[PDB]
Amino acid sequence: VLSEGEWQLVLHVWAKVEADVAGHGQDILIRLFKSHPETLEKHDRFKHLKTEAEMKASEDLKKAGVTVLTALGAILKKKGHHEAELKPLAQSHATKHKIPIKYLEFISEAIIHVLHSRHPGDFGADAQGAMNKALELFRKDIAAKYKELGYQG
Numbered sequence: 001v002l003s004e005g006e007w008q009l010v011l012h013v014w015a016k017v018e019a020d021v022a023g024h025g026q027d028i029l030i031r032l033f034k035s036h037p038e039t040l041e042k043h044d045r046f047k048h049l050k051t052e053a054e055m056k057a058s059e060d061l062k063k064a065g066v067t068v069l070t071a072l073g074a075i076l077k078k079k080g081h082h083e084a085e086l087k088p089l090a091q092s093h094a095t096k097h098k099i100p101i102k103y104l105e106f107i108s109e110a111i112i113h114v115l116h117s118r119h120p121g122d123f124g125a126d127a128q129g130a131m132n133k134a135l136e137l138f139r140k141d142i143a144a145k146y147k148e149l150g151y152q153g
């Protein structure tokens with residue numbers, strides 16, 4: 001559990017993300033791919049990209065970032081009561097895309113990095129700690145679902 005104040009910290013900084021979902025998505029995916037290049041291999045449409053500029057110019061990458069953040073924002077807004085939203089995501093990520101937990105850790109790291117970089121006043125120790133808890137809970141619960149589906153990733 002997060003407290004209600006922790007949830008509110010999460011959603012307060014999220015509202016900043018919602019002002020420009022695509023640009024935040026671009027920064028987060030580029031951070032993920034630069035930090036953990038093996039992750040890029042999972043995206044057949046754009047796995048050939050090399051430079052930061054190429055990544056910024058890619059329509060497909062920009063769409064992917066919005067796809068992620070739209071889903072994740074809907075998850076966060078449930079304040080832990082997200083089983084229904086996690087169900088389809090676990091299904092595709094376990095059985096189709098095969099995204100291991102370690103990669104969800106990497107993207108969680110990238111999200112934290114970008115929020116700290118862009119919104120430090122809204123991302124002090126309080127809010128960092130609350131977002132860390134929120135993303136940990138997402139990963140815990142998705143991991144259980146993965147296993148239910150037969151995927152030990």
Ligand code: HEM
Nearest residue numbers: 039042043044064067068071072089092097099103104107
């Ligand atoms: C916060 C974590 C994540 C969220 C909320 C998320 C969400 C989504 C959603 C909503 C879709 C479209 C529907 C679906 O196929 O389920 C999608 C597709 C996909 N996801 Fe994720 N995702 C996450 C993390 C990741 C990571 C870390 C990777 C790869 C390293 C990944 C790889 C893919 C792939 C390969 C697709 C298919 C389309 C594509 O190639 O771009 N996802 N994801």
Ligand SMILES: O=N[O-]
Nearest residue numbers: 029032039064068
């Ligand atoms: O690489 N996240 O889709």
Ligand SMILES: O=N[O-]
Nearest residue numbers: 082083086141145
């Ligand atoms: O709590 N989600 O499976």
